[PDB]
Design a protein around this nucleic acid. Structure first.
Ligand SMILES: [K+]
Ligand SMILES: [K+]
Ligand SMILES: [K+]
Ligand SMILES: [K+]
Ligand SMILES: [K+]
Ligand SMILES: [K+]
Ligand SMILES: [K+]
Ligand SMILES: [K+]
Ligand SMILES: [K+]
Ligand SMILES: [K+]
Ligand SMILES: [K+]
Ligand SMILES: [K+]
Ligand SMILES: [K+]
Ligand SMILES: [K+]
Ligand SMILES: [K+]
Ligand SMILES: [K+]
Ligand SMILES: [K+]
Ligand SMILES: [Mg+2]
Ligand SMILES: [Mg+2]
Ligand SMILES: [Mg+2]
Ligand SMILES: [Mg+2]
Ligand SMILES: [Mg+2]
Ligand SMILES: [Mg+2]
Ligand SMILES: [Mg+2]
Ligand SMILES: [Mg+2]
Ligand SMILES: [Zn+2]
Lengths: 129, 101, 204
RNA sequence: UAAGGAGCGAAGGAGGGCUAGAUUAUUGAGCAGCGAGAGGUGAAAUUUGAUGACCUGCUUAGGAGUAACAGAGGCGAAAGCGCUAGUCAAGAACGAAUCCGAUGAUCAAGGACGUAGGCUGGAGGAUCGAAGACGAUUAGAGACCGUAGUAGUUCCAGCAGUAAACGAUGCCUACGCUGUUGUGGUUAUGAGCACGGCAGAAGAGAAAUCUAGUAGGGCUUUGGGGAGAGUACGCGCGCAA
């Protein structure tokens, strides 16, 4: 019946935390925002698939209030000269949005890769543990 | 005593090579010596493809993949168990490993 | 104090494609048309070719970018601002045992806009042949690259943007390259990789 | 001359100097949206945020670097060399009925180059980070880990002269088994020439293994049980180290 009213959803997924943030198609207006660390207590759980899932539900609720129906997803890790694998939690944000009623448009990996780069932290020997 | 004929590295007929940084600890390692690993991972997990089939707006959809080459120093490769210690006759066997997902 | 209540939606419109209207954007309500211009003009968005055309599901690998230019009532009108291939396509294309050929060139439209174009091609391994790799010799790569630049100059230099956009849609430059350069060596995956707007002329 | 140097023809290479451009990325500022946490770890604290962080837009300013392709691949006397065009000298190899005719090998003294870190003067200053300062852990940590931070790290003109500067195997020149796989030319398309990798064999060696097989070919360097000692005195170079 109804047309598909679309929003953008950005997802950042590092080793330490996950950040979820909905915007208009222009990226220049913000509709809702949450993080894993907002909902959980212990610092070691901010990357947890569970904390990501709790934080996604709050964002899904506010979007349903503002009257949105469909979503495009752009997802990333940290990149630059650092790690460029998508962290834990990133792939549970997406599955949660699908259990909520939302129709999924398109998914894209938008991690910032460098053609060559500045020097990384850690010294010539690296972390010793 | 000399443990390996190739000194543990792939350099021949050269003076010097570019360095790269270890994924796990950021140590510098020469490119011709570093342990290398290839990854091709779907953006969406296998446990969600059955929901994707009812969530998508398109008639059919192909999931996007993500591609990586990772580098490791000797200590990290041994500790993460990418490689293992082997007997004096096994050391000589060379075979290509699988691409991970 | 629910600020969200106090916002005005406007519809985004585009040209030289089969689909005219693509979505809508918010702003806080304002008294003066001069303010609304200064708030909306300068914004940007991107759209996949598969969304703004009726087409084979294969053509999803390309994105187009548009910059807001003008306001009329409910509608914001937006103009061409570049083209880009999707990350999955770029990363999936590169393979071991083959050579990449790459180029950068600058061109000028009749309208006066200056554009910068990035181009890619890959070598191909012939059939009935048993060597493991099909690398291209360094001097031969310079022959291909020299040819690519005259093809881009012939196709796009001194044209209108209405003409350029349809050439990009139909992928004519890739097709021409594969035809023309086959005499030098066999090639595959010939594509325009990125188009970037460098200078726009001071106009009223 | 399957000794050397000069020259001709077609071609190949991250070899070197210079000129003019480039896609991203990391920081810093401006402005806009949002309204509570971000960072970091095995687990945490220093620390930063309502003077609006984080994240998402648009603008800009700089200084480094050339990912993936990329290899038991290529080039260089070694140290070393990876974006694109244009320009300037010289060299290696190959093809062949070109020219001169012993012009040659190795080398005390003497001369030129030499990663990095260091020093003298100028330019500049993104990222990283000796010293120094904190937060934790410990009997104690001055260390390892985290926050922060300076000299240096870049460029031009020079000094210095050391490295596990290693394939730990001097340079010319010989005689020598097989199979396989590369790179660049040439081809009666059968093969060759230069530079490599790999796997056996036979000999060799205390073995491990083989740049180590055979041998009164030529020339230089160099060792003679551990320690004290690459130290004392004298001398030569260096601004000092
Ligand atoms: K954490
Ligand atoms: K928290
Ligand atoms: K809390
Ligand atoms: K060396
Ligand atoms: K190795
Ligand atoms: K040059
Ligand atoms: K130096
Ligand atoms: K200290
Ligand atoms: K203490
Ligand atoms: K420290
Ligand atoms: K730092
Ligand atoms: K010198
Ligand atoms: K000297
Ligand atoms: K020495
Ligand atoms: K050689
Ligand atoms: K011996
Ligand atoms: K002395
Ligand atoms: Mg350890
Ligand atoms: Mg031992
Ligand atoms: Mg702000
Ligand atoms: Mg490159
Ligand atoms: Mg010559
Ligand atoms: Mg220095
Ligand atoms: Mg000698
Ligand atoms: Mg003695
Ligand atoms: Zn490591």
């Amino acid at each position: 019946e109804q047309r598909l009213n679309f929003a953008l959803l950005f997802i950042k997924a590092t080793k330490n935390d996950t950040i979820i943030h909905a915007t208009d198609l222009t990226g220049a207006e913000t509709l809702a925002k949450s993080s894993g660390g907002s909902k959980v207590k212990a610092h070691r759980d901010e990357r947890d698939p569970y904390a990501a899932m709790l934080a996604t539900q709050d964002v899904a609720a506010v979007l349903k209030e503002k009257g949105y129906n469909a979503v495009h997803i752009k997802i990333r890790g940290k990149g630059g000269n650092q790690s460029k694998i998508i962290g834990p939690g990133g792939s549970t944000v997406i599955r949660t949005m699908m259990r909520s009623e939302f129709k999924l448009g398109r998914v894209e990996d938008v991690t910032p890769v460098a053609t060559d780069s500045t020097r990384k932290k850690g010294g010539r020997r690296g972390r010793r543990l | 005593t000399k443990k390996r004929s190739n000194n543990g590295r792939s350099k021949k007929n050269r003076g010097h090579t570019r360095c790269v940084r270890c994924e796990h600890c950021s140590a510098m390692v020469p490119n011709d010596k570093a342990i290398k690993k290839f990854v091709v991972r779907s953006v969406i997990d296998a446990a969600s493809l059955d929901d994707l089939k009812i969530a998508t707006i398109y008639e059919e959809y192909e999931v996007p993949k993500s591609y990586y080459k990772l580098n490791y120093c000797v200590s990290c490769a041994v500790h993460i168990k990418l490689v293992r210690v082997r007997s004096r006759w096994e050391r000589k066997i060379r075979k290509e490993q699988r691409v991970s997902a | 104090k629910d600020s969200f209540l106090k916002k005005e939606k406007y519809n985004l419109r585009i040209e030289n494609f089969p689909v005219r209207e693509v979505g809508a954007t918010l702003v806080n309500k304002q008294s003066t048309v001069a303010a609304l211009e200064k708030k909306l003009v300068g914004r940007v968005f991107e759209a996949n070719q598969g969304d703004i055309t009726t087409s084979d599901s294969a053509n999803c690998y390309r994105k187009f970018s548009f910059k807001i230019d003008s306001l009329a009532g409910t509608n914001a009108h937006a103009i061409f601002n570049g083209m880009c291939l999707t990350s999955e396509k770029i990363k999936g294309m590169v393979k071991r045992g083959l050579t990449l050929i790459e180029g950068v060139k600058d061109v000028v439209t009749k309208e006066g806009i200056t554009l910068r174009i990035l181009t890619i091609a890959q070598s191909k391994k012939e059939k009935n042949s048993t060597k493991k790799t099909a690398y291209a010799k360094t001097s031969v790569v310079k022959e291909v690259r020299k040819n690519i630049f005259r093809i881009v100059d012939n196709e796009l230099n001194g044209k209108d943007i209405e003409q350029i956009v349809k050439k990009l849609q139909m992928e004519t430059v890739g097709k021409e390259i594969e035809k023309e350069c086959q005499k030098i060596i066999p090639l595959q995956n010939c594509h325009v990789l990125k188009v970037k707007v460098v200078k726009r002329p001071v106009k009223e």
